[PDB]
Design an enzyme around this catalytic site. Structure first.
Site, PDB file in Angstrom:
ATOM      1  N   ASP A 208     -24.332  11.374 -15.802  1.00 49.84           N
ATOM      2  CA  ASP A 208     -24.653  10.654 -14.476  1.00 49.84           C
ATOM      3  C   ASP A 208     -26.045  10.784 -13.692  1.00 49.84           C
ATOM      4  OD1 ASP A 208     -21.653  10.124 -14.362  1.00 49.84           O
ATOM      5  OD2 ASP A 208     -21.017  11.872 -13.647  1.00 49.84           O
TER       6      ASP A 208
HETATM    7  N1  ATP Z   1     -17.320  13.958 -19.017  1.00 48.42           N
HETATM    8  C1  ATP Z   1     -16.274  13.500 -18.626  1.00 48.42           C
HETATM    9  N2  ATP Z   1     -14.929  13.473 -19.195  1.00 48.42           N
HETATM   10  C2  ATP Z   1     -13.912  13.353 -18.658  1.00 48.42           C
HETATM   11  N3  ATP Z   1     -13.723  12.934 -17.101  1.00 48.42           N
HETATM   12  C3  ATP Z   1     -14.934  12.822 -16.454  1.00 48.42           C
HETATM   13  C4  ATP Z   1     -16.199  13.242 -17.150  1.00 48.42           C
HETATM   14  N4  ATP Z   1     -17.282  12.902 -16.078  1.00 48.42           N
HETATM   15  C5  ATP Z   1     -16.349  12.647 -14.903  1.00 48.42           C
HETATM   16  N5  ATP Z   1     -15.188  12.570 -15.119  1.00 48.42           N
HETATM   17  C6  ATP Z   1     -14.180  12.014 -14.134  1.00 48.42           C
HETATM   18  O1  ATP Z   1     -14.678  11.669 -13.076  1.00 48.42           O
HETATM   19  C7  ATP Z   1     -14.103  12.086 -11.960  1.00 48.42           C
HETATM   20  C8  ATP Z   1     -15.152  12.448 -10.631  1.00 48.42           C
HETATM   21  O2  ATP Z   1     -16.185  11.788 -10.888  1.00 48.42           O
HETATM   22  P1  ATP Z   1     -17.569  12.323 -10.087  1.00 48.42           P
HETATM   23  O3  ATP Z   1     -18.865  11.559 -10.747  1.00 48.42           O
HETATM   24  O4  ATP Z   1     -17.521  12.466  -8.765  1.00 48.42           O
HETATM   25  O5  ATP Z   1     -17.500  13.844 -10.925  1.00 48.42           O
HETATM   26  P2  ATP Z   1     -18.844  14.737 -10.308  1.00 48.42           P
HETATM   27  O6  ATP Z   1     -20.114  14.544 -10.451  1.00 48.42           O
HETATM   28  O7  ATP Z   1     -18.378  16.338 -10.818  1.00 48.42           O
HETATM   29  O8  ATP Z   1     -18.458  14.827  -8.504  1.00 48.42           O
HETATM   30  P3  ATP Z   1     -19.224  16.035  -7.736  1.00 48.42           P
HETATM   31  O9  ATP Z   1     -20.587  16.523  -8.581  1.00 48.42           O
HETATM   32  O10 ATP Z   1     -19.904  15.148  -6.541  1.00 48.42           O
HETATM   33  O11 ATP Z   1     -18.441  17.259  -7.732  1.00 48.42           O
HETATM   34  C9  ATP Z   1     -13.078  13.192 -12.395  1.00 48.42           C
HETATM   35  O12 ATP Z   1     -12.017  13.193 -11.953  1.00 48.42           O
HETATM   36  C10 ATP Z   1     -13.534  13.282 -13.780  1.00 48.42           C
HETATM   37  O13 ATP Z   1     -12.046  13.166 -14.342  1.00 48.42           O
HETATM   38 MN    MN Z   2     -20.120  13.296 -11.975  1.00 48.46          MN
END
Ligand code: ATP
Ligand code: MN
Ligand code: MN
Ligand code: ZN
Ligand code: ZN
Lengths: 64, 114, 263, 133, 148, 83, 188, 146, 36, 764
Positions: H116
């Site tokens: 991301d």
């Molecule tokens: N590598 C991955 N494998 C499985 N699920 C993922 C993965 N990356 C993100 N997700 C899914 O995306 C969802 C949330 O997305 P988001 O981009 O907001 O995660 P994040 O970057 O950790 O958010 P934040 O950093 O703001 O706390 C989660 O419920 C998660 O299951």
């Molecule tokens: Mn994320």
């Protein structure tokens, strides 16, 4: 706020085309796409530049 | 900020050289030259010529991190044949074929209207 | 004249389509890059603001001035400011341009880059002039004023390369293709039902023979012919984006021979 | 310095399954009831059809760098169309009271069933493979 | 349910069996019902297991409830971590749950009880300006006068 | 309350924690210009020096291991097997 | 102040996935289309299939047509806009119709074995950026080490670290102590 | 004979209607009225956009130059979205937008956009892409109750 | 009470002005203090 | 204090154990370094540069305890350092520092990294440390801590350093693997058809930093020198590494290019994907760690990345709206799939409507009806989605991610391309929140699919308004459930850690609390460290009685059941020998008991269980290392084997006490490993299967023994905290039947609750 000078992506000058683009629509009655291609903006990157400009300065100029 | 000035991409700091040439330990008649304030433009080009030379046993380049304008080119050659010599031979060809091409072009352009 | 061969197919003040023929992909690609990144050119790179009652902020304006392309045909005969022995800038390293505008009319007064006055000695090198390519000869719109509003500025231009900031780049897009049929199998085409129904034929295909379904793949072929098209923004005429482009490479590679000699 | 098996084969079958450049010949020996070839080939560099036929030789030369053609501009221990270089991983499937030797050419795989060259096929890598059409 | 059981010739086979499963629990009494196998009855109430079959059988129920939770999500944790926990919960013999100046309250109690603080914790050791006898602190290092 | 050199029942292998603490106690000393016992075949880095020391078995220190009941064994650096 | 985008700043589409800029590339070094179009931004495919944000992908197709044709592209929910229709229109305009294009590697000019989904998509710059966010407190005259961080250090066995970090600079005072009545009563 | 690419709808098995919706897209609020194609998104995501939109920078009013607020972000060059919703007309999002149409590639290219993250074009930045103005106002009172 | 949110409290808040539609959104918010 | 916090980004050009620290942050934090003759020159230079040019220094402190401030100090350019002063220097390349992403729920959330000083303003990290830190690059920040003394620097590098945490105790496997791009691409690289040409090969080769300079020989010589993708990755896998794996019908000629086989550090067959190079029980990173140690293993993740991301940068990979469109014919089949399920539903409906349906046994009629319609509708969703999967091609980029393991799964294909399916709120179909209806667009008493939340459409196709609203109902419940999970989980985690935090292993191998109480008489019932334990199969346990007796019975008195003389030099000479037979009967009786014992321990027959010392991979090594011919009898004797394996048992020591009690403990501790041992080095296996020589055999043993001894747990480990963090940290990725489950259950457990939500008896 005001036409940007160039296409962010390719560098083409585009800041000398705004008055014309607008003349081409209101004065000669072309649809936005025909008008753009008449100014020679033929890649979608430049087209996006004129087509999605929003001339905020026209509002800003109304304040004293 | 923490951003290095843009001039740093093409212009040598105090103490730095265009080339540093170092012998390679791994194999014989091999060298590694590191080029500063250069990138792929040069690095893919010298490289690809070094390979048109049949006394050229190895050639390869890489920019190890995208933050720094520097590349590292490794030439290996046949016994008797200095690698620095292969890089004159190859920079020489380059200049020559381009020579050529600015001429073939300056030409084709007066053959021209509009 | 043996070697890398040329073949213009169109030309225009603004573009030049051609075909390089008998060369490596690398040198082709390299010339592409140089044209994009390293051809010197002239561009506002310092702006002093005496007055701005405009509706735009100063760095907003400044930034826009760096982007107005300025004549650059004679830019070899302008030294880079950092190689010049002057304290700061002068006539050997710099054009200086002025801009004054006052919103005199009731209705809205535009500021265009033709309203840019050079203020320094050119030594009759053809540089500095705002470039103008619209029917009305306004060139670029810089700002807009209301009745009562004012903007006065000086700028310094300086020679520069797009590596350092794209404002200094002469080229705009650069078309670049090879092997339009796909014969080399350098790419593998994605498709649902049929690869050929689903992808559009390049214009560059006409110029080259379709392959024949029997023909078993040619392992020895290489990439020898390139379809280019260089488009100029105008600070430099086109042919000159190429020629200075070839020339800049050739100097890069010579600084490498010069510094083996100094080893 | 040698060569070490050599015979002529009949092609039963050419499967490409799922790949584009690569296919799996099932061939027989014309000669022995016993000796078979299952083998992976680059079909773009060297096409091959059902019932085509093959002169197949394993060999073992003509482990230092690799250096381009030049030695290769006279010096060919090949008069063939098609040469690979692999590694035996064997399982001596020593099955029935016939042998099977295995071989991998950067992952293009081979297998010979048979018997008469048990005191013949290198325990070992350095193994080239060679084909004319 | 299918149950892997050795076959007459030695290999494991499936052999289905009916099983009953209940809402609610009466272990002491259901165990005693004619026709069941009382040696294999189970409940997810580990308290009842400990009340009827004792501390060890409860310890081994409790592990198996903990392990179910962690595997039902589909993850895997080595035995010995859950074993540690479940030992900590059962080592007194029942099931014990795991869930400038303040505090004075507590030091008064210490006083009156004659609390002996072993000094093995990291906070107590901080207050004293010392390393805690954990990890790298669980031995001393001394100068080796015995060597040449 | 001490446990005779014979009859010692704890591992003859050095633990990761002892090793970490040794190397670091010794690098602290080498870092404060304490004499060194091994040939610096170049090294300037006190940890690194200490590790050379531990490998050549020239660290004269003793690990006192307490058992939970107060009693202890003494094991020399020299003697502890380093794996 | 003017804020020019930088490594570290955050950006998002309108489909509920953000990112930070992890590096910038000048245009030469970017991959390009035969028309010499180059991306303003490059996002990773691994960000897609799990989040099932198909509306991103559809917005990019629709947005390519819109630019090419000069019309506003109707992305409202609940209409009869279809990918199939979008794709038709984009084919009419000369591109492959699912939005792939051949592109070429910047460093080499060689073509790319795989083609690339390429199109405008509307991105937002979000507030709150590497300059507001960086600090660095080590004294002269989150960002902490709490209960949980101590626990991890205990897990690793790092007692010396844990003593150094959790000390006072409150100096080690020295003190005599009776060995019979542990108290600090000793007249020294 | 329905269009294989349309969604399935389950017909009027109803002759008693008393009313009809004006438009189903009116179930949405202000924020989710700016997402394109929300009917093609998993639902939590439209929920996350409906928060982030509230952090985007655009032009909050035409009068910013004359206000003095604690903090404010105006983007240099707002562009209106190539992909809009019919609700936006009422929300004036085309007039005071919060975004730019960026040319986007979806690609693995170098490994610096994993997990991301994104590669952005420096040259594009040079020429203005996503640049913005930030303003801080500080206040102070005078003397008081001494 | 307008300066504080003192009422039921969070009842009055500073109007968001990050962006035009964050404003509109704030003006159209609702809150529920305190079985699904 | 001595720490910094920023935004993180990934970087493919950093090593696994590095962290990039911006230069500005590196000129703010400092380490006090003592002048000595080894560093007075460097310190001098660092002083002269001062606070604002990095490599520099901010203070100097002399003998006195006097603090000299380099930014002010009228003498800042004129300090002549003394031995024994101190210089507080900026941190610099290769100082150890500790890096941490909050919440720190397990110890690999705080690992020591080597600094690398870099430009711009983010802390940067290798993609493969991401997963232990549970961190990504959309905003996340992390904290970096600078150790302040030499002992503290040693602790961090010799115990918390990233390389030492590749294989963790939590799950006795790696906790770091190849991810994302380099995983999409290593598979691509490794396909049958991927060949590379010489120009690109040599640039891949020079990309591996410690390539010996040898160009390998190409797998194609003939029309053209073309090397495989396999061979070139192999350049990065070091020598003496062996790994094999069989997938669902892999063979040694893998038609499909399944499984994996790798010999002396070269891939023979198999595409490389997540099972090989992921963080997987017995894959390459677990193998390499153990066979060659932490530092090489940690280089390997960067050499694989360097290679593979180079290749991927020139190959390309993308995904697009196209990858979610399935075939016109597939769609019709999906739509019928779905139509049939709606007809099943319709009968079950008419059936309940006529009163013809039966419940069965304490289950209501309506509960029966719903359970059946929901099976129907789920079974449809699933068929519809299998349909779409199948129909997509190998070049479908969604599929290519799923196949690699790098991102996405079936459910995602399905819902994007075929059908989203039944939405639910609290385990049930959308309920009637208007009177007898789910929305006012429907008429009353409607139990049909659409009325109760079946979403027939895919995402591609789009949802209808009613679907849209029921899927948001759905969705909201997981947003809520998610916040409740995270909060419940965090409190658990802290309480387990506070409960277990004082438990430690002691130099008697006992595990005890701060009182000295015994919790366990030996840690883990076996005295091992969970990092050194691997899933192995215990052979005696399975199989038929005939089969176990072919494989292990040696009968020297029987011409059918002796050791053929081609197995062994002595073979002629032992036929009919009575006194060898006595030993061999003794070894068999112990195999027999072994099998009985274990089938009592593992009532089920499960043969695969974590144990220390991967014997198969030692034997595989011995086989490689002594070039062993399957074609010559061995020179091992009967007694060499039989008595050599008995003697090795005596030296697998966990406890060392001279009394009887400690001896019994020691024997009990080492029972299960000894069963696997005697099963693996029984006479007929050693000769007939493994074909060991005497020398290789003697090498097998002395290694078994060193490895065994290195698995034992170390006194001083804080296994409590560890236990707690191991149980809590995975209880945090419970973000997600009719028994109380998952986190509330686990609350119910640790709380010891009198009043449980679903109590149940299972009675056989
Ligand atoms: N590598 C991955 N494998 C499985 N699920 C993922 C993965 N990356 C993100 N997700 C899914 O995306 C969802 C949330 O997305 P988001 O981009 O907001 O995660 P994040 O970057 O950790 O958010 P934040 O950093 O703001 O706390 C989660 O419920 C998660 O299951
Ligand atoms: Mn994320
Ligand atoms: Mn994140
Ligand atoms: Zn453009
Ligand atoms: Zn000058």
């Amino acid at each position: 706020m005001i036409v940007p000078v160039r296409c962010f992506s390719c560098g083409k000058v585009v800041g000398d085309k705004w008055e014309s683009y607008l003349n081409l629509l209101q004065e000669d009655e072309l649809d936005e796409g025909t008008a753009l291609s008449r100014l020679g903006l033929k890649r979608y990157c430049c087209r996006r530049m004129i087509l999605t400009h929003v001339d905020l300065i026209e509002k800003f100029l109304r304040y004293n | 900020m923490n951003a290095p000035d843009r001039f740093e991409l093409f212009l040598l700091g105090e103490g730095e050289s265009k080339l540093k040439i170092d012998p390679d330990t791994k194999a014989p008649n091999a060298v590694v030259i590191t080029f500063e304030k250069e990138d792929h433009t040069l690095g893919n080009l010298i490289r690809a010529e070094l390979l048109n030379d049949r006394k050229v046993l190895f050639a390869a380049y890489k920019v190890e991190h995208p933050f720094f304008a520097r590349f590292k080119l490794r030439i290996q050659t046949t016994e008797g044949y200095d690698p620095k010599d292969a890089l004159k031979n190859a920079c020489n060809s380059i200049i020559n074929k381009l020579g050529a091409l600015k001429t073939n072009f300056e030409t084709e352009w007066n053959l021209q209207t509009l | 004249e043996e070697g890398p061969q040329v073949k213009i197919r169109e030309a225009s003040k603004d573009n030049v389509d051609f075909i390089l023929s008998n060369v490596d992909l690398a040198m082709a690609n390299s010339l592409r890059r140089v044209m994009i990144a390293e051809i010197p050119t002239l561009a506002i790179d310092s702006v002093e603001v005496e007055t701005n009652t405009t509706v735009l902020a100063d760095e907003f304006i400044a930034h826009r001035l760096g982007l107005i392309p300025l004549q650059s045909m004679d830019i070899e005969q302008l030294e880079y400011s950092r190689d010049c022995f002057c304290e700061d800038h002068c006539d050997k390293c710099s054009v200086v341009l002025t801009l004054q505008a006052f919103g005199e009319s009731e209705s809205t007064t535009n500021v265009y880059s033709k309203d840019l006055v050079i203020v320094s000695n050119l030594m009759g090198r053809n540089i500095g002039h705002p470039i103008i390519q619209d029917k009305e000869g306004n060139g670029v719109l810089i700002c807009k004023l209301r009745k009562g509003q004012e903007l006065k500025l000086t700028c310094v231009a300086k020679k520069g390369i797009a590596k350092e900031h794209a404002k200094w780049g002469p080229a705009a897009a650069i078309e670049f293709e090879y092997d339009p049929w796909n014969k080399l199998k350098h790419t593998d085409y994605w498709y649902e039902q049929d690869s050929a129904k689903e992808w559009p034929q390049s214009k560059n295909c006409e110029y080259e023979d379709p392959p024949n379904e029997g023909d078993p793949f040619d392992y020895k072929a290489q990439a020898d012919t390139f379809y280019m098209n260089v488009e100029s923004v105008g600070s430099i005429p086109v042919d000159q984006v190429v020629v200075r482009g070839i020339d800049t490479l050739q100097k890069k590679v010579a600084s490498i021979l010069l510094a083996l000699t100094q080893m | 310095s040698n060569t070490l098996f050599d015979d002529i084969f009949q092609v039963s079958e050419v499967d490409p399954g799922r790949y584009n450049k690569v296919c799996r010949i099932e061939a027989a020996s014309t000669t022995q009831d016993q000796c078979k070839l299952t083998l992976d080939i680059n079909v773009e560099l060297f096409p091959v059809a059902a019932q085509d036929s093959l002169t197949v030789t394993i060999a073992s030369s003509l482990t230092r760098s690799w250096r381009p053609p030049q030695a290769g501009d006279r010096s060919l221990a090949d008069d063939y169309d098609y040469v690979m270089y692999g590694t035996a991983y064997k399982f001596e499937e020593v099955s029935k009271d016939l042998i099977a030797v295995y071989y991998s050419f950067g992952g293009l795989l081979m297998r010979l069933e048979g018997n008469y060259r048990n005191l013949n096929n290198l325990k070992q890598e350095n193994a080239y493979l060679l084909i004319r059409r | 349910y299918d149950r892997k059981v050795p076959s007459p010739t030695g290999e494991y086979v499936k052999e289905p069996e009916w099983v009953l499963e209940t809402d609610g629990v009466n272990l002491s009494e259901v165990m005693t019902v004619p026709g069941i196998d009382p040696t294999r009855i189970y409940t997810n109430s580990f308290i009842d297991i400990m009340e009827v079959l004792g501390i060890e059988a409860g310890r081994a129920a409790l592990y198996k409830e903990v392990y179910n939770v962690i595997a039902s999500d589909g993850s895997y944790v080595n035995y010995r971590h859950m074993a540690l926990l479940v030992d900590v919960m059962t080592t007194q013999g029942g099931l014990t749950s795991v869930t400038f100046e303040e505090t004075v309250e507590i030091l008064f109690e210490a006083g009156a009880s004659a609390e002996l603080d072993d000094c093995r914790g990291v906070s107590e050791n901080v207050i004293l300006g010392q390393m805690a006898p954990i990890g790298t602190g669980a031995f001393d290092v001394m100068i080796d006068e015995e060597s040449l | 309350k001490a446990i005779p050199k014979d009859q010692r029942a704890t591992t003859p292998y050095m633990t990761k924690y002892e090793r970490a603490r040794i190397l670091g106690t010794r690098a602290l000393q080498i870092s404060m210009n304490a004499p060194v016992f091994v040939d610096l075949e170049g090294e300037t880095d006190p940890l690194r020096i200490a590790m050379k020391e531990l490998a050549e078995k020239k660290i004269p220190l003793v690990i006192r291991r307490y058992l939970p009941d107060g009693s202890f064994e003494d094991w020399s650096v020299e003697e502890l097997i380093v794996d | 102040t003017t804020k020019i985008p930088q490594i570290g700043d955050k950006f998002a589409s309108r489909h509920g996935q953000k990112g930070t800029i992890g590096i910038t590339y000048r245009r030469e070094d970017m991959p390009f289309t035969a028309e010499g179009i180059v991306p303003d931004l490059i996002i990773n495919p691994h960000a897609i299939p799990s989040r099932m944000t198909v509306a991103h992908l559809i917005e990019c197709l629709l947005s390519k047509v819109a630019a090419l044709s000069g019309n506003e592209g109707d992305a409202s929910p609940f209409t009869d806009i279809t990918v199939e229709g979008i794709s038709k229109l984009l084919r009419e305009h000369g591109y492959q119709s699912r939005g792939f294009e051949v592109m070429y590697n910047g460093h080499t000019g060689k073509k790319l074995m795989a083609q690339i989904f390429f199109g405008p998509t509307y991105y937002q710059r979000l507030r709150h950026m590497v300059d507001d966010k960086i600090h660095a407190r080590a004294r002269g005259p989150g960002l902490r080490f709490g209960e949980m961080e101590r626990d991890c250090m205990i897990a690793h066995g790092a007692a010396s670290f844990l003593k150094e970090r959790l000390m006072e600079a409150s100096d080690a005072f020295r003190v005599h102590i009776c060995g019979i009545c542990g108290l600090m009563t000793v007249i020294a | 004979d329905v269009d294989p690419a349309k969604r399935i709808r389950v017909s009027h098995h109803a002759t008693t209607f008393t009313h009809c919706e004006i438009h189903p897209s009116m179930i949405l609020g202000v924020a989710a009225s700016i997402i394109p194609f929300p009917d093609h998104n998993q639902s939590p995501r439209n929920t996350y956009q409906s928060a982030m939109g509230k952090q985007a920078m655009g032009v909050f009013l035409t009068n910013y130059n004359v206000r003095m607020d604690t903090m404010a972000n105006i983007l240099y060059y707002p562009q209106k979205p190539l992909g809009t919703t019919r609700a936006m007309e009422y929300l004036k999002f085309r007039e005071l937008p919060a975004g730019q149409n960026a040319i986007v590639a979806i690609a693995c290219y170098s490994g610096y956009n994993q997990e991301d993250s994104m590669i952005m074009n420096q040259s594009s930045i040079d020429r203005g892409l996503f640049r913005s103005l930030f303003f801080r106002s500080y206040m102070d009172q005078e003397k008081k109750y001494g | 009470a307008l300066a504080t949110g003192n009422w039921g409290a969070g009842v009055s808040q500073v109007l968001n002005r990050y962006t035009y539609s964050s404003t509109l959104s704030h003006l159209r918010r609702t809150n529920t203090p305190i079985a699904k | 204090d001595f720490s910094a916090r920023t935004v993180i980004s990934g970087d493919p050009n950093l090593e696994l154990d590095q962290v990039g620290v911006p230069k500005s942050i590196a000129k703010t934090l400092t380490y006090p370094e003592v002048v000595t003759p080894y560093n007075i020159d460097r310190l001098t230079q660092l002083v002269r540069n001062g606070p604002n040019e990095h490599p520099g220094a901010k203070y100097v402190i002399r003998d006195s305890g006097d603090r000299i401030d380099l930014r002010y100090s009228k003498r800042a350019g004129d300090i002549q350092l003394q031995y024994g002063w101190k210089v507080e220097r900026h941190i610099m390349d290769n100082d150890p520092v500790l890096f941490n992403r909050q919440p720190s729920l397990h110890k690999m959330s705080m690992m020591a990294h080597r600094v690398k000083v870099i430009p711009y303003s983010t802390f940067r990290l290798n993609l493969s440390v991401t997963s232990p830190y549970n961190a990504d690059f959309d905003g996340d920040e992390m904290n970096l801590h600078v150790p302040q003394s030499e002992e503290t620097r040693a602790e961090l590098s010799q115990l918390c350093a990233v390389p030492l945490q590749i294989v963790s105790p939590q799950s006795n496997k790696p906790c770091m693997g190849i991810v994302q791009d380099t995983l999409c691409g290593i598979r691509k690289l490794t396909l049958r058809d991927t060949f590379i040409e010489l120009d690109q090969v040599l640039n891949m080769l020079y990309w591996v930093p410690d390539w010996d300079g040898v160009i390998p020989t190409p797998a194609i010589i003939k029309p053209k020198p073309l090397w495989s993708g396999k061979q070139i990755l192999s350049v990065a896998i070091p020598n003496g590494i062996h790994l094999q794996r069989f997938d669902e019908g892999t063979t040694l000629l893998s038609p499909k290019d399944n499984g994996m086989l790798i010999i002396d550090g070269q891939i023979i067959f198999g595409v490389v994907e997540k099972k090989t190079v992921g963080s997987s029980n017995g894959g390459l990173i677990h193998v390499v760690t153990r066979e060659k140690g932490p530092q090489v293993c940690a280089k390997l993740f960067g050499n694989i990345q360097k290679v593979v991301n180079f290749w991927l940068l020139h190959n390309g990979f993308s995904t697009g709206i196209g990858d979610t469109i399935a075939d016109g014919p597939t769609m019709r089949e999906i739509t019928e799939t779905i139509a049939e399920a709606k007809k099943k539903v319709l009968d079950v409906t008419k059936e309940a409507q006529a009163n013809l349906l039966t419940a069965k046994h304490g289950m209501t009629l309506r509960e029966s009806f719903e359970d059946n319609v929901v099976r129907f509708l789920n079974e449809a969703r699933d068929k519809a989605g299998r349909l779409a999967e199948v129909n997509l091609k190998d070049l479908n980029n969604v599929k290519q991610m799923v196949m690699a393991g790098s991102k996405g799964s079936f459910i995602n294909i399905a819902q994007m391309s075929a059908c989203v399916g039944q939405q639910s709120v609290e385990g049930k179909r959308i309920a009637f929140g208007f009177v007898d209806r789910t929305l006012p667009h429907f008429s009353k008493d409607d139990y049909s699919p659409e009325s109760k939340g079946f979403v027939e459409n895919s995402y591609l196709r789009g949802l209808t308004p009613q679907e849209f609203f029921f899927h948001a109902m759905g969705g909201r419940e997981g947003l809520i459930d998610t916040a409740v999970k995270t909060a419940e989980t965090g409190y658990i985690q802290r309480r387990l850690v506070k409960a277990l935090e004082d438990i430690m292993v002691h130099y008697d191998n006992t595990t005890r609390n701060s009182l000295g109480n015994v919790i366990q008489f030996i840690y883990g019932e076996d005295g091992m460290d969970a990092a050194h334990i691997e899933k192995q199969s215990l052979d005696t346990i399975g199989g038929s009685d005939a089969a176990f007796e072919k494989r292990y019975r040696v009968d020297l008195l029987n011409t059918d059941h002796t050791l053929d003389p081609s197995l062994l030099e002595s073979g002629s000479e032992i036929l009919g020998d009575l006194k060898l037979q006595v030993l061999l009967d003794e070894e068999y009786k112990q195999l027999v008991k072994d099998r009985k014992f274990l089938r009592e321990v593992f009532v089920d027959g499960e043969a695969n269980w974590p144990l220390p010392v991967n014997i198969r991979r030692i034997i595989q090594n011995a086989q490689q290392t002594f070039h062993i011919d399957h074609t010559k009898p061995s020179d091992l004797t009967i007694k060499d084997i039989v008595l050599g394996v008995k003697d090795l048992q005596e030296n697998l020591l966990v406890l060392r006490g001279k009394n009887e009690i400690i001896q019994n403990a020691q024997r009990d501790a080492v029972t299960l490993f000894c069963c696997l041992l005697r099963s693996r080095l029984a006479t007929r296996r050693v000769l007939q299967e493994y074909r060991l020589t005497k020398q290789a055999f003697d090498w097998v043993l002395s290694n078994i023994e060193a490895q065994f001894l290195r698995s034992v747990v170390h006194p001083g480990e804080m296994v409590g905290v560890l236990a707690a963090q191991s149980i809590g940290e995975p209880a945090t990725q419970m973000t997600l039947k009719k028994v109380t489950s998952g986190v509330p259950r686990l609350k119910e457990i640790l709380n010891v609750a009198k009043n449980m939500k679903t109590p149940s008896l299972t009675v056989y």
